[PDB]
Amino acid sequence: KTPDDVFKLAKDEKVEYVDVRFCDLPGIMQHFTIPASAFDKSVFDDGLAFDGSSIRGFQSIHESDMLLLPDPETARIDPFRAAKTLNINFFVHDPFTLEPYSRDPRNIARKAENYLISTGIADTAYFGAEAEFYIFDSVSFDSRANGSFYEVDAISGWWNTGAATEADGSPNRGYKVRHKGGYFPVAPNDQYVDLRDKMLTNLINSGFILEKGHHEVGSGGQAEINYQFNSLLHAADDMQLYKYIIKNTAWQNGKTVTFMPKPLFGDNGSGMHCHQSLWKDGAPLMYDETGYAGLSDTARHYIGGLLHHAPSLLAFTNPTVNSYKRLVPGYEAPINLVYSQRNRSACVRIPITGSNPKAKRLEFRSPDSSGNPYLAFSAMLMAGLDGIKNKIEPQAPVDKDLYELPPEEAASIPQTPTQLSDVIDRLEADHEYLTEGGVFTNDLIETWISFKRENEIEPVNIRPHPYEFALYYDV
Amino acid sequence: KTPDDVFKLAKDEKVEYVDVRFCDLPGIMQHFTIPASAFDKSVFDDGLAFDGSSIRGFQSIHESDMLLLPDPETARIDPFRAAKTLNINFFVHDPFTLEPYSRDPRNIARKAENYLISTGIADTAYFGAEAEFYIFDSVSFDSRANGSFYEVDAISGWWNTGAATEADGSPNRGYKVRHKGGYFPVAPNDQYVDLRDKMLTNLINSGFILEKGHHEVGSGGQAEINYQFNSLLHAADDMQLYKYIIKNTAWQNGKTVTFMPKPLFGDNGSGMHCHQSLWKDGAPLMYDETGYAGLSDTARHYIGGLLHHAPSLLAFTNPTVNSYKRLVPGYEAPINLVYSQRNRSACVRIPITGSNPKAKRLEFRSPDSSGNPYLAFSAMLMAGLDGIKNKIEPQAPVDKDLYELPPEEAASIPQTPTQLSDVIDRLEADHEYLTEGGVFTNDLIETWISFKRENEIEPVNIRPHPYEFALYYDV
Amino acid sequence: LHAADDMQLYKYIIKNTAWQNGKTVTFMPKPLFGDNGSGMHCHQSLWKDGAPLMYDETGYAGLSDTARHYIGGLLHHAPSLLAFTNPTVNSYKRLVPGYEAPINLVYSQRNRSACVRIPITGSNPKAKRLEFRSPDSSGNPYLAFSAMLMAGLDGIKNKIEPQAPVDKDLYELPPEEAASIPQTPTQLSDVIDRLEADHEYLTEGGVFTNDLIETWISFKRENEIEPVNIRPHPYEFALYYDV
Amino acid sequence: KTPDDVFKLAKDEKVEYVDVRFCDLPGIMQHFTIPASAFDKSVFDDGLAFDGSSIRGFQSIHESDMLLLPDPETARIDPFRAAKTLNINFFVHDPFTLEPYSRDPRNIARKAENYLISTGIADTAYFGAEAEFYIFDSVSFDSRANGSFYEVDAISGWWNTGAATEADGSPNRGYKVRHKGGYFPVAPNDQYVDLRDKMLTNLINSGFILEKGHHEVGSGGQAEINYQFNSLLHAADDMQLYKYIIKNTAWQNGKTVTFMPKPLFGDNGSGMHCHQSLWKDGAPLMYDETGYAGLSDTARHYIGGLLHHAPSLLAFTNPTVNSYKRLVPGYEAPINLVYSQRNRSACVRIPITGSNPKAKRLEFRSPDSSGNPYLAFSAMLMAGLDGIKNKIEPQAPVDKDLYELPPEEAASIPQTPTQLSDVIDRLEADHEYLTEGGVFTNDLIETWISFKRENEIEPVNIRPHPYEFALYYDV
Ligand SMILES: COc1ccc2cc(-c3nc(C(C)(C)C)[nH]c3-c3ccnc(N)c3)ccc2c1
Ligand SMILES: COc1ccc2cc(-c3nc(C(C)(C)C)[nH]c3-c3ccnc(N)c3)ccc2c1
Ligand SMILES: COc1ccc2cc(-c3nc(C(C)(C)C)[nH]c3-c3ccnc(N)c3)ccc2c1
Ligand SMILES: C[S@](=O)(CC[C@H](N)C(=O)O)=NP(=O)(O)O
Ligand SMILES: C[S@](=O)(CC[C@H](N)C(=O)O)=NP(=O)(O)O
Ligand SMILES: C[S@](=O)(CC[C@H](N)C(=O)O)=NP(=O)(O)O
Ligand SMILES: C[S@](=O)(CC[C@H](N)C(=O)O)=NP(=O)(O)O
Ligand SMILES: [Cl-]
Ligand SMILES: [Cl-]
Ligand SMILES: [Cl-]
Ligand SMILES: [Cl-]
Ligand SMILES: [Mg+2]
Ligand SMILES: [Mg+2]
Ligand SMILES: [Mg+2]
Ligand SMILES: [Mg+2]
Ligand SMILES: [Mg+2]
Ligand SMILES: [Mg+2]
Ligand SMILES: [Mg+2]
Ligand SMILES: [Mg+2]
Ligand SMILES: [Mg+2]
Ligand SMILES: [Mg+2]
């Protein structure tokens, strides 16, 4: 798309407002609105200003002013606003030099794609993502001097089988979902068919090419929708728009969605599996009929990179304290650093795709939706490329239920990290593969580390956990 | 129907979504949705993937990926979804070899039909089913360390005659159904006429050929709807679609349906009587004007097989712990292994059909709706075929009220099994008739036995029953 | 006899002390799911002319031949004996693994996972005895104590050898070794069935008579086994409402 | 005291019951009651039995039987029970060999005292302890699939200044305690004067020699009572009895006490400061008028041991997950490994005592009351003795407010450990100083490590924290 394409779209759709969007460092989209009458060439030539000091991971207060420049490829009609609105993503730029911002997640993705080309290894990295989520009815929580709580709730939650009535006083009609039992019985066990249909339709209407939708394993309304893969940057833009459409379709229909990794204890977490492949000149590079699981050397070394760099890479792919509550055995999330075909207990699964080279790819199962897809996809690529460049050999595939391994065998396999502080520590110690070609810079890495320590790790560490009262009140 | 018939139907009905369905081992339909735009030749040629490890009785996690291939004969428009949807049943296949899965219930029914043809005994097994159900208003239940409960409720339930008001605060207007008195007074005693009409209409609109609908014996909204018989596999597909339509028609109209065998204590259970007959080259094989109740030798030996194999066959026809609460005297369900014409106390009843050979058949009254109709119909066929093949003579018909037999004559007649663990034990010991022709395989039988022990028998056995408190609190 | 009279008076005193102080006591075997049941362990010994018969310093766990054969009787007759020592439907909810009640028919010293535990008592012959851990308080101590005695006496009289002691955690046995050890019965109807089939050891000397045994069997079937069997369990709704 | 002293006491006090007490591994006293008529010589000669498999950190089920032998020095009349009762502590012994149990905490303290004598360094280790606690009104908590909470409450809690009424509906009369403001205004600001007087009186009546009692810093009823120091084993027996008397005095007066390290967020935690000194032949060893803070070489090396071994020693002195919520800056608990005179921000404070050598001692401020005083005191002694034996020099004292240090300066002094798993890891790697003289054995250490990982560390790590919902619900 071009500037004129977007003006034509705005005029043809009789748009009243344009919503100007960009990504903060942690991974939440930010926006303000301008009237259609203020959406002109000047927006493309001069850009628009905002307060960089109010955005997380951006500027200090005395260097606050920042600039935004539009990305016409991202233009979509908003499905939700009563006043017709056109959404457009922007790149953040220095207001003096007009140089791209070093802490703009969209710029990182841009740099990753260009660095890929410059290596000669490939020209395109394709990402297909599966962002699972929960469709809840309610949530509340607080944290005080003398107490703390959370509660999420959902009509289909198994914890509600004994409820005398529903939240509105209507009768309990059963057909609630058992823990680990949501994947994927027909209605009325599946209570979210019509809502997920609306989500699917909203996505179709925003130009997504859809593949499937279904209830997921978790009780209390776990769900998954799949759309067509795309190249790195487009894929990360798609992810952000997808989360927006999912959350707001739920909202407009009286529900509340979360993408957090582990909202329920003793039921499945929500992952963001990333299917990845490299292509060059319109041809796939991942396939070799003679390799294990049909994998070429390039593919195997990419995996070698992911598994070798995992202890620091998870700082971007599993970036929250809650992430590490998902990385526990028995829930189809990884607990150790292995690859294996057909294996949903592994860190990297190779899906069964047959002899078609175009379909051959790896599924990185470790990542979740709790962070920044621009940074996450970029970091994965940089790990994989380091793997290829250094010919990093992964340890042998383990074609077993990785949660049921004998002690002697399990201990010869590197584990996933236990907690956020460990991966942040490791990122600080070893991040050279990310800085290759200036894709990630030290200022971004240092800001990230600092942000996670001060705003996440420390605040959780100093606050007493309710289960400590269960354990220790009577010491 | 062919692939092109289904594409034409999808296009003519302006379908937005296709719902991909298959059967788990215990007997619940599973589904995910794809857009109409993804429903193409590739769905027929390459199939679709799912996670076999999340489906009960299927795969382990390290061998998770499974494949689905469509069955065009099963294509129907969904009556419920606001976004126009086409439902299609699939067969489950190995993703490497594309071999039919040994634990796909739809495959077992396929295999049973082929085995029948290969014996030369007949070419067609027809099944007519009567799946009774209850239309409740509510249900709740739970199970904790210090207590446990269930409660079902229904406006027409006799337990509510003394209620001051209905659930919504409106007046009690009487005309509630007496225990064992629901079959079948006119409205207003029958409070479900309009709802059953809606169920009937939804079935007609999904291509069912309807025979009748009525209130059943049980208080609190017991019901029965009959549709035309069909050959085994088609009949099992019809049963699954029927349960879906009944449950969801109820759900959309503010009710809640259960097909469990015995939700009410001291009132009728819900059975799945199976009327069965064999045909060859378009001619019936069950009829002989000179036999007892018009039955041929072939028919009598089929019955011999059902009654001889019953102690293990009920593992598939009466597959739940709750099944055995229905097999008690006084409620038109069987308590012993006899056949008899006109006799609703018997295990096999021969309905009165006159001299028309095409109407001659046996009614197996033992089965209920708590399991898997693909496996249940197949197992019944295998038992009946073993009877024909071995010329198993049933014991003499007993034309009496089998609940009022003097202890002396009753002691000579074999009883129905008391509990699930007994039939599971017997299935394990003796299942050769099921494995004939590889219709059932040992892996299916072993998985079934193991599933029932670990997920049903044991969990119920270890949990104190509320009536034990009535009996023993004061010991 | 004195011990059975003591047991009845004890239950009365416990229940009523609780009652007078605003509480309510139950002796049922398993009132809580996922926590310990309540047993009635019976420590037993035979004496003659003021001297103990259970002790032999050379035997496993200090046990004489007389003691070992008594145990042989308890464990051999268990499938029918539990009809009097574990006489309720609720009894069988207690005989599950992980709660210091028995799940199989073995004896073993120091072992709270076993059916018969030999407590550690040292060299004093007067303290030597066996602890039968299987019984609970849900029945009749007069009949329970008597039945245990009759089983133990049949063991002595027929020199019934118990199978070898198993000094392990009987709940953590590998499926292989566990398959070789006889299990405790699963349910009341099984022990009642077995009592009906084989009760000769109880009728010795006319201690139990056939009228008592027949009345017992008939009572348990009609008033306990059948009434529980015909009533849907709440967990069946958890399992099957949505079938 | 002797056996006959105890019999005389029991007879003179007209005791009806004797309470038999011993310590489990984590640090909770266990008990059963025998009638006075069963308390005879046999209790001393033969001992009493119990089920070692029901006691945490003791026996497996197949080796369950354990033996108890009385310690006549510990006999005290119980202040609480209406039926007159004598409490006696016991040692746990092997029932075959009568050898002292290797996992009896009271045995470890016994061993530690003997090992001290055997080194020739000193013959007596004196411990003066300050076990702070909270006097709350209520507590509740739970942990479910979809939510979790705790709440503590106290009339004097600052969170209650805006309450319309008190819990019983009586008026809010103010005079509540500000956060960090409880040390130590007069009544009515101090609302616990009469209750602490009752606690003081019960202690005096159980033969404690009292020094002081006061409100402590924390809002919502923090308190401290001090009794006279003693030698190691007697001191640990005194601590256990003290906790019992405090808890039950509170209970009988309608309150609820906790000794947990950090029950309130943003207010003082509760420590167990341990004042320590070594004496030989009735003379003190800690004093040298020429040393910093009046400390001898022996004293300085003992401190060297404490600080050097701290990373593993805290596994016994700070043994819970909640312990590490107290080791945060700003609350008069340590955040780093320094000693300093007069300094309540330090790990080891040297109180100001003047020129009297008998009063010279070190205050180890790190420990809390959440574990086992027998093991805690013993472990501290072992670390100190290793310091003396190896002449470990502590780093120079730092006479500054350790919480106010700019971050670059703070980083130049070794920190206290962040979390329990770290000290448990370190204990596993390095514990030789504890095994000297067989005082701690490998079986105890391995059981401890194993208990903490399986029952505490892992269960807390897998459970989502309420503040994670505050941080991440909307990711
Ligand atoms: C038959 O030719 C193709 C070409 C590309 C294909 C791509 C996918 C694909 N789907 C997904 C999700 C949406 C299920 C996560 N990811 C991919 C994907 C992602 C990255 N690279 C490739 N090659 C495929 C799936 C099938 C394909 C088939
Ligand atoms: C007059 O010619 C016929 C031919 C087939 C007929 C089949 C039925 C039939 N109806 C039922 C239900 C729906 C009431 C359970 N089952 C059968 C049935 C089933 C299997 N085989 C046969 N022959 C009949 C009933 C009447 C028939 C009459
Ligand atoms: C004047 O002679 C002495 C002798 C011993 C003394 C002991 C203490 C003392 N008090 C405490 C608490 C109760 C406040 C924690 N701890 C000690 C203590 C503990 C261990 N060793 C010594 N020397 C003193 C305090 C003053 C002393 C004064
Ligand atoms: C069924 S699942 O394996 C579940 C994944 C799980 N929720 C996770 O935490 O990654 N996902 P998919 O089959 O869509 O890859
Ligand atoms: C009236 S009934 O006999 C009732 C059957 C009963 N509910 C059963 O449990 O099988 N059924 P039908 O007459 O439809 O065969
Ligand atoms: C501690 S326990 O082993 C518990 C026995 C358990 N309640 C039972 O059901 O037998 N009893 P004891 O040690 O008194 O013999
Ligand atoms: C006033 S304080 O310094 C407070 C100690 C704090 N509660 C702690 O957590 O160690 N105690 P003390 O003066 O009794 O040694
Ligand atoms: Cl962390
Ligand atoms: Cl059963
Ligand atoms: Cl039973
Ligand atoms: Cl920890
Ligand atoms: Mg998926
Ligand atoms: Mg998924
Ligand atoms: Mg996936
Ligand atoms: Mg009918
Ligand atoms: Mg009927
Ligand atoms: Mg019928
Ligand atoms: Mg006992
Ligand atoms: Mg103090
Ligand atoms: Mg203090
Ligand atoms: Mg102090």
Question: For the residues of C83-146, what is the DSSP string, one character each?
Answer: HHHS-STTHHHHSSTTSSS-SBS-EEET-TTSSEEE---TT-GGG--EEE---BSSS-HHHHHH
Distance of CA C227 to the CA centre of its chain: 24
Domains of chain A: 2-104 (3.10.20.70), 105-463 (3.30.590.10)
Q: Which residue of C has its CA nearest to A186?
A: C242
Q: Is D65 in the pocket of ligand 6 (CB under 6 A)?
A: no
Write out residues with Cβ below 6 Å of ligand 2: B 126-130, 211, 226, 229, 275-277, 356, 358-359, 361
CA distances from D432 to B41, D309, D420, D427 (A): 71, 10, 20, 9
The contacts of residue B75 (CB under 8 Å, 6+ apart) are B1, B5, B6, B9, B86, B87, B88
C-alpha distance across the termini of chain A, in Å? 66
What radius of gyration, in Å, describes the C-alpha atoms of chain A?
Answer: 23
Collapsed DSSP state (helix, strand, coil) of residue A308: helix
Collapsed DSSP state (helix, strand, coil) of residue C226: helix
Optimal mutation site among C106, C107, C108, C112, interface D, most CBs of chain D within 10 A: C112
Helix (H), strand (E) counts: chain C:
10, 6
Method: X-ray
Told to judge if D436 belongs to the known catalytic residues of this protein, a careful annotator would answer no
| Residue-by-residue DSSP string for D275-340 | EEEEEETTEE-SB-TTSGGGB-HHHHHHHHHHHHHHHHHHHHHS-STTHHHHSSTTSSS-SBS-EE
Count of Cβ atoms closer than 10 Å to residue C177 Cβ:
11
Which residue puts its alpha carbon closest to atom 12 of ligand 1? A128
Write out residues with Cβ below 6 Å of ligand 7: D 130, 132, 183, 217, 224, 268-271, 273, 326, 331-333, 344, 365
Q: Is D126 in the pocket of ligand 3 (CB under 6 A)?
A: yes
Query: A229 is written with which tokens?
Result: 């893969």
Q: D–B contact (≥3 CB pairs within 8 Å)? A: no
Q: With breaks defined as C to next N over 2.5 Å, after which residues does chain A break?
A: none
Cis peptide bond upstream of D440, omega within 30 = no
Collapsed DSSP state (helix, strand, coil) of residue C20: helix
Alpha-carbon gap, residue A320 to B102, rounded angstroms = 43
Q: Please report residues of A whose CB lies closer than 8 A to that of D468.
A: 150, 260, 320-322, 325, 460
Which residue(s) pair with C107 in the sheet?
C116
Interchain CB distance below 8 Å, C171 and D95: no
Helix (H) / strand (E) element for B468: namely: helix B466-472
Alpha-carbon gap, residue C59 to C70, rounded angstroms = 14
Write out residues with Cβ below 6 Å of ligand 5: B 130, 132, 183, 217, 224, 268-271, 273, 326, 331-333, 344, 365
Q: Please report residues of A whose CB lies closer than 8 A to that of C235.
A: none
**Which residues of D line the annotated binding site for Mg(2+)?**
130, 132, 216, 224, 273, 363
Q: A–C contact (≥3 CB pairs within 8 Å)? A: yes
Give the distance (Å) from ligand 1 centre to CA of residue A128: 6
Collapsed DSSP state (helix, strand, coil) of residue B329: coil
Alpha-carbon gap, residue A373 to A233, rounded angstroms = 9
Which ligand has its closest atom nearest to the C-alpha of D270? 7
Which residue puts its alpha carbon closest to atom 14 of ligand 5? B130
Torsion-angle region of residue A226: left (phi > 0), alpha (psi -120 to 50) or beta?
beta
Closest-CA residue to A28 (of A105, A80, A103): A105
Told to judge if D224 belongs to the known catalytic residues of this protein, a careful annotator would answer yes
What are the backbone dihedrals phi and psi of residue A6, each rounded to the nearest 5 degrees, phi first? -70, -40
Which residue puts its alpha carbon closest to atom 7 of ligand 2? B359
The contacts of residue D385 (CB under 8 Å, 6+ apart) are D115, D116, D119, D121, D302, D305, D433, D436
Interchain CB distance below 8 Å, A146 and D154: yes
C-alpha distance across the termini of chain B, in Å? 66
Query: A170 is written with which tokens?
Result: 């209507």
Closest-CA residue to D417 (of D317, D348, D349): D317
Alpha-carbon gap, residue A81 to A15, rounded angstroms = 11
Contact by Cβ (8 Å): B47, B67: yes
Which residue puts its alpha carbon closest to atom 3 of ligand 6? C100
Closest-CA residue to B212 (of B221, B220, B223): B223
Q: Is A237 in the pocket of ligand 4 (CB under 6 A)?
A: no
Which residue puts its alpha carbon closest to atom 16 of ligand 2? B128
Count of Cβ atoms closer than 10 Å to residue D427 Cβ:
23
Count of Cβ atoms closer than 10 Å to residue D398 Cβ:
17
Interchain CB distance below 8 Å, C241 and B265: no
CA distances from A435 to A56, A392, A439 (A): 21, 18, 6
Q: Is D130 in the pocket of ligand 3 (CB under 6 A)?
A: yes
Which ligand has its closest atom nearest to the C-alpha of C41? 18
Q: Is D51 in the pocket of ligand 6 (CB under 6 A)?
A: yes
> Which residue in A418, A460, A472 is closest to D467 by CB distance?
A460
Contact by Cβ (8 Å): B53, B69: no
Query: D302 is written with which tokens?
Result: 């003992």
Alpha-carbon gap, residue D225 to D209, rounded angstroms = 11
Alpha-carbon gap, residue A341 to A363, rounded angstroms = 10
Q: Please report residues of B whose CB lies closer than 8 A to that of C186.
A: 421, 461
What are the backbone dihedrals phi and psi of residue A10, each rounded to the nearest 5 degrees, phi first? -60, -40
> Which residue in C110, C120, C122 is closest to D62 by CB distance?
C110
CA distances from D237 to A27, A130, D52, D74, D102 (A): 56, 59, 21, 7, 18
Told to judge if D16 belongs to the known catalytic residues of this protein, a careful annotator would answer no
> Which residue in B21, B32, B140 is closest to A164 by CB distance?
B140
Closest-CA residue to A109 (of A238, A1, A18): A238
Query: A348 is written with which tokens?
Result: 């990297």
> Which of these is catalytic: B19, B71, B130, B267?
B130
Interchain CB distance below 8 Å, C110 and D65: yes
Query: B109 is written with which tokens?
Result: 């029914």
Cis peptide bond upstream of D171, omega within 30 = no
Alpha-carbon gap, residue C91 to B321, rounded angstroms = 20
Q: How far is D3 from chain A (nearest CA, A)?
A: 31
Give the distance (Å) from ligand 19 centre to CA of residue D125: 20
Alpha-carbon gap, residue A368 to A274, rounded angstroms = 9
Interchain CB distance below 8 Å, D49 and C119: yes
Told to judge if A363 belongs to the known catalytic residues of this protein, a careful annotator would answer yes
Query: D19 is written with which tokens?
Result: 């309470």
Mutate to test the pocket of ligand 1, among A361, A365, A377 (most ligand atoms within 8 A of CB): A361
Q: Please report residues of A whose CB lies closer than 8 A to that of C242.
A: 174-175, 189
- Count of B-C CB contacts under 8 Å: 140
Which residue puts its alpha carbon closest to atom 27 of ligand 1? A359
Told to judge if A51 belongs to the known catalytic residues of this protein, a careful annotator would answer yes
Told to judge if B123 belongs to the known catalytic residues of this protein, a careful annotator would answer no
Q: CA torsion angle for D367, D372, D375, D376 (degrees, to 10)?
A: 10
Q: Which residue of B has its CA nearest to A185?
A: B30
Closest-CA residue to A216 (of A91, A123, A344, A338): A344
Q: A–D contact (≥3 CB pairs within 8 Å)? A: yes
Ligand 6 atom nearest to CA at C37: 9
Give the distance (Å) from ligand 15 centre to CA of residue B363: 10
Helix (H) / strand (E) element for D105: namely: helix D105-119
Residue showing tokens 């925003």: A206
Nearest 5°: CA angle at A28, between A201 and A212? 25
User: Given in angstroms, what resolution was this structure solved at?
Assistant: 2.3
Interchain CB distance below 8 Å, C242 and A175: yes
> Which of these is catalytic: D113, D190, D216, D238?
D216
Alpha-carbon gap, residue A269 to A271, rounded angstroms = 6
Contact by Cβ (8 Å): A416, A335: yes
Alpha-carbon gap, residue D318 to A174, rounded angstroms = 48
Q: Which residue of B has its CA nearest to C11?
A: B475
